[PDB]
Amino acid sequence: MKTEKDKMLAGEMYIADDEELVADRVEAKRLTRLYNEAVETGDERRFTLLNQLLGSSADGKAQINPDFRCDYGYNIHVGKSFFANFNCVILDVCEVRIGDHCMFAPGVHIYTATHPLHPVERNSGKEYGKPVKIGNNVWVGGGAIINPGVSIGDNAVIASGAVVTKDVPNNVVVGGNPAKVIKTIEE
Amino acid sequence: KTEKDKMLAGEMYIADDEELVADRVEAKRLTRLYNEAVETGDERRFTLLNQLLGSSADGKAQINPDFRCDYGYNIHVGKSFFANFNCVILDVCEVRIGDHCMFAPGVHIYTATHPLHPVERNSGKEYGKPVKIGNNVWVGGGAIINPGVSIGDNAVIASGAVVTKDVPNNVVVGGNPAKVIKTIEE
Amino acid sequence: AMKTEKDKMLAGEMYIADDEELVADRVEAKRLTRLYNEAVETGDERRFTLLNQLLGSSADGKAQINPDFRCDYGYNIHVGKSFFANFNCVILDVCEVRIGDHCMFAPGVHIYTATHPLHPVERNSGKEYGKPVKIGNNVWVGGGAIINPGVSIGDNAVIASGAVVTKDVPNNVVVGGNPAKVIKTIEE
Ligand SMILES: CC(=O)SCCNC(=O)CCNC(=O)[C@H](O)C(C)(C)COP(=O)(O)OP(=O)(O)OC[C@H]1OC(n2cnc3c(N)ncnc32)[C@H](O)[C@@H]1OP(=O)(O)O
Ligand SMILES: CC(=O)SCCNC(=O)CCNC(=O)[C@H](O)C(C)(C)COP(=O)(O)OP(=O)(O)OC[C@H]1O[C@@H](n2cnc3c(N)ncnc32)[C@H](O)[C@@H]1OP(=O)(O)O
Ligand SMILES: CC(=O)SCCNC(=O)CCNC(=O)[C@H](O)C(C)(C)COP(=O)(O)OP(=O)(O)OC[C@H]1O[C@@H](n2cnc3c(N)ncnc32)[C@H](O)[C@@H]1OP(=O)(O)O
């Protein structure tokens, strides 16, 4: 009684080649291409296009540099004054919730998509995701990776190249691969 | 024997050889067309890919934009190949990938490399080492797979992993440099 | 003096990112980068003449940079002779990026001179800053390596693929890992 798209958003195994999901993706790719051309050439319509790609932004003025990639787009919800530098990728099979005043340096990747560890489940045509939640005033450094299901508290700083495999508390700098706490921000 | 011959054989070759240069230029030119085909959703994406890749077991490899490669023709994939956004494959030597393999976004595979010593490195000659990836390998996002590496069946490469040496069957590797994190029981 | 935000930025002082001159500079860099990338991708002979308008300087006007290259300003990037960068390198040149001769970047290398305050309020103040990056001669940066702001890399250094370079790197070493550590030295 659930559609594949229902299952996907729900964290449950779903069929990636479901006809609706497929059409959502070819649409996202098409719009993303227009968006990228718009931001690359500095056209004011980039916001109009972004605002049809992203599931939502708090101020309809998110700044995202080229070439952005996403799976669906509509699962991405960002707060006020969102900035993302060159070449960010967001696999938003599940919800990606980002707070206010967040900044991504170039090449930041956020994944909610994943697979089973075992070859048969994984090769079975089904797969699933775990939503990612990012707080307020989070600064993600260049090339960091935020794995599925991860949550990052407010005022956190992800160092460049960090592979964030576990939740990150408020007011910490984390770094490394896998990332660990390396400092506490004092207020 | 041609510079292309030495290249495939893992020997020092002259990167600026006339034939190799034209190969690389054709590859870039066709890659742009392919990437546009995928981005716009045109079903001629497959025909293009099949002209670019060395071979595909089912002619139905699913590779998202923007794919980049050196030659293309040294890449051979099994069936149901999938690579997500922004994968890069430097196929100066053979890159052989099994069946049901999945690359997440931003996976890089390098067969190309250079001499550690300045003079040799700058001498206009380079070399490669082939990469072999078995069946049912899942490579996580932003993993790097170095020249010469082999990855055995059912291995999963964690996201961000820098895979500097061989990966046996049925393990999960992670980290930088990568190391075994757990074995898999299937 | 008659000192602008751009002047503070170059000097490594806090600057207002959205200063109209700087904003317009970044917009120009993007338009030109898009042409450049198209020129190199399609194999056109004018790629060099375009690249020479983008970069601050090159020693020989013949730098080889594969698509899709990206940079903040372009004009803070100064390369020596025989520069090579493979696919998808990003350079944030808010401050100077000086690169010596015979350097080669593998795909996906990122050089950052841009950074931010660690505290949220200062970071959200519309102000930011940078620390310049200096890379010597005969440097090979392996694929996906990251050069952080303020880093110096000595002559003949080899950065392993995936290395995250957070501190100065001396002459004639191979470094690797996260954070990058010396693995071995290299002498000719
Ligand atoms: C094809 C497509 O486009 S979709 C795929 C796109 N998305 C991805 O790439 C997701 C990447 N997934 C990962 O990296 C996961 O960490 C996987 C593959 C290793 C799966 O691991 P999981 O067991 O489900 O998560 P979990 O965090 O619990 O793993 C356990 C441990 O390994 C860890 N671990 C996870 N990632 C790493 C890592 N990169 N390096 C070292 N250890 C790691 C944890 O540190 C953890 O430690 P512990 O059990 O000793 O306390
Ligand atoms: C939004 C935009 O477009 S601009 C942003 C683009 N550029 C970036 O991404 C820059 C990334 N910045 C960083 O990673 C920095 O190193 C930060 C955020 C950790 C700032 O920390 P700092 O205090 O200025 O450097 P500091 O050397 O003191 O940090 C301490 C240690 O952590 C380290 N450390 C710093 N950066 C990292 C890192 N990227 N990865 C792992 N460890 C790191 C250091 O190795 C250092 O070692 P030590 O205490 O053992 O001597
Ligand atoms: C410009 C272009 O387009 S071409 C380049 C495209 N592709 C590249 O980036 C290739 C990258 N090559 C590498 O990173 C190699 O690992 C290099 C440069 C470090 C050279 O390493 P080599 O000495 O030839 O191979 P080797 O695997 O024997 O290196 C030895 C050690 O360093 C290691 N080592 C290799 N890579 C790393 C790494 N990323 N981090 C830490 N240690 C590493 C090994 O663990 C090894 O340890 P040990 O001998 O103490 O047990």
UniProtKB/TrEMBL annotation, chain B:
Origin: domain of life: Bacteria
Binding site for acetyl-CoA 1: 84, 112, 141, 159
Binding site for acetyl-CoA 3: 112, 141, 146, 159, 164, 176, 182
Protein name: Maltose O-acetyltransferase
Pfam families the record matches: Hexapep, Mac
Molecular function via GO: maltose O-acetyltransferase activity
GO cellular component term, pick one: cytosol
Domain Maltose/galactoside acetyltransferase: start-end pairs: 4-58
Acyltransferase as UniProt keyword: yes
Keyword annotations: Acyltransferase, Repeat, Transferase
Biological source species: Bacillus anthracis (anthrax bacterium)
Similarity-based family: Belongs to the transferase hexapeptide repeat family.
EC number, UniProt record: 2.3.1.79
PROSITE patterns xrefs: HEXAPEP_TRANSFERASES (PS00101)
Keyword presence, Ion transport: no
